[PDB]
A paper describes a structure:
Although the physiological function of R2lox proteins is not known, the cofactor catalyzes formation of a tyrosine–valine ether cross-link in the protein scaffold. Two proteins from this group have been characterized to date, homologs from Mycobacterium tuberculosis and Geobacillus kaustophilus.
The cross-linking valine, which is completely conserved across the R2lox group, was changed to an alanine, isoleucine or leucine (V72A/I/L). Crystal structures were obtained of all three R2lox point mutants in the non-activated reduced and the oxidized resting state by soaking apo-protein crystals with MnII and FeII under anoxic or aerobic conditions, respectively. In the wild-type, the hydroxyl group of Y162 is hydrogen-bonded to the carbonyl oxygen of V72 prior to cross-link formation, and this hydrogen bond is maintained in V72A/L-R2lox in the oxidized state. Primary or secondary carbon atoms, however, cannot be oxidized by the Mn/Fe cofactor of R2lox, likely because the resulting alkyl radical would be too unstable. The V72 mutations demonstrate that the Mn/Fe cofactor is capable of oxidizing tertiary, but neither secondary nor primary carbon atoms.
Numbering used by the authors:
A (entry chain A): 3 to 286
B (entry chain B): 3 to 250, 263 to 286
The structure:
């Protein structure tokens, strides 16, 4: 039952950080995947040999499942904060969920447009990927339906916002630009990636806000945050090494397009993101 | 756990009715309550007598709580359809939920602007209103966390989309126009109502789609729909009568609009 309603008894807290993030989301979130022109992407993909065609699909396979999981698995966080009466967080999360829906749509439209929608891309999810996206992420979020303790909320935001979004997604955006933007391939996908990257800035800020406000009540949760980050790192880098090894064994695209794909630079960027996400949470 | 992902094994079902409704929601759902100019509404409100001021508040109190319940209480429907693999339904429901968030925002901005944000409008929720919005609606939606049977889904969509939205919300939009537009009062609020009414057409279309697809599998669910509608009617009309009595423009015309909405929502679901 509802005991009452904040906007009947009072008003929205207009100065709440998540209300302000909600306002930015509305201003900055107007893009529509359906407006992206993928016609040149189709031409580029058809121009590639079978070998070069593969080069791109592991990254896309990882994003497409990632966005779909993101759309499904944010709902328990919205429920948990709703039940706690955090109306402004809920408002913001409506924009978060609608963002992820557009991300799912964007990658699916690209697969359809380039002619691979019929191809099962699950073959590029190795065991580490599945540990994060098929298992740990839904387990951490779904926990919130029966356990919305500070410990549970911190773990959910860590896995979702700090690891999946703040480490993997961010490193995937960078990787996409380092490879396909340099090669001049897939302009529509790159337009998508840039929209996604803009959206993701708000999603990571929500996670930072959430974790920090819990750490602010008891700095003992800071150690829990660090620990959960470190627990998932082996699967983060396990997946990144899988992708790297795939890239190193599929050299055709980089040769054709005169790219010196510095995979050691990519790996360094992932480590960099992981440690900088840790640093955006303060003990005090 | 996730067993797999539809957009990795295949793609979105581009022809799915809720994907089409999602596409329409993006194209038609751009409005922003922060852009509505409420400055004249403030002046209009200040120009009313004390008694006229209090005459406007019950309808607003009904809506502000209704939108807030709507925002919170659609989440279990999104979860249950997600768990069923109904990906295109979920995509659409992200636009549904963000719509209700903007509706909450719009009424609260109006209350702030005209100077009543500090006033507790719960005084204007009577027992019938509470039965629907404080109790039956959250009860029926939250049930979906543990029971997503066809019967539970039909009941949730009946209470939410056909009664709260399809009967009360639609009747409130009409009421605001019949009263305040003819009076030339609260133009910002009426711009908001127009945007809300446009959004609401999609929300009601989702409820129709959901209820009919369950009815299509077994015609005995049609009788459940009708029964759930009738069960809620006494509270619908008990709240409407309470509002009508406070006002004492043609209240009988308004009251008949509610009955008309109720019946036509019933008619939009087919036995066969
Ligand atoms: C070769 C370097 C590897 C870099 C790592 C690439 C990671 C690709 C996986 C993308 C999944 C991101 C899902 C985002 C979820 C969200 O949007 O909230
Ligand atoms: C004087 C005649 C009364 C007519 C009916 C007035 C009803 C007021 C509306 C309250 C509920 C609105 C909540 C709808 C939720 C949504 O937007 O989905
Ligand atoms: Fe995200
Ligand atoms: Fe609605
Ligand atoms: Mn391994
Ligand atoms: Mn009564
Ligand atoms: Mn995303
Ligand atoms: Mn509404």
């Amino acid at each position: 039952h509802h005991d009452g309603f904040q906007t009947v008894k009072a008003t929205i807290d207009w100065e709440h950080p998540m209300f302000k993030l909600y306002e930015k989301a509305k201003r900055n979130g107007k893009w529509n995947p359906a407006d992206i022109d993928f016609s040149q992407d189709q031409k580029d993909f058809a121009s590639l040999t079978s070998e070069e065609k593969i080069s791109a699909l592991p990254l896309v396979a990882g994003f497409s499942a990632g966005e779909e999981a993101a759309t499904l698995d944010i709902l328990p966080m919205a429920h948990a904060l709703a039940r706690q009466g955090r109306l402004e967080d809920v408002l913001f999360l409506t924009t978060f969920m609608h963002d992820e829906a557009k991300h799912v749509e964007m990658f699916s439209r690209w697969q359809q447009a380039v002619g691979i929608g019929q191809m099962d891309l699950s073959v590029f999810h190795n065991d580490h990927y599945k540990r994060i996206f098929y298992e740990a992420l839904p387990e951490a979020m779904n926990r919130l339906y029966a356990d919305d303790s500070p410990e549970a909320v911190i773990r959910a935001a860590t896995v979702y916002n700090m690891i999946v979004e703040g480490t993997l997604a961010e490193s995937g955006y960078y990787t996409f630009r380092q490879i396909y933007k340099k090669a001049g391939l897939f302009p529509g996908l790159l337009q998508g990636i840039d929209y996604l990257n803009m959206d993701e800035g708000r999603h990571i800020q929500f996670g930072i806000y959430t974790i920090q406000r819990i750490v602010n009540e008891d700095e003992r949760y800071y150690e829990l945050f660090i620990r959960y980050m470190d627990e998932l790192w082996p699967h983060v880098i396990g997946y990144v090494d899988y992708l790297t090894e795939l890239g190193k064994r599929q050299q055709q695209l980089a040769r054709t397009y005169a790219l010196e794909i510095d995979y050691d630079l990519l790996r360094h960027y992932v480590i960099k993101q992981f440690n900088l996400r840790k640093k955006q949470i303060s003990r005090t």
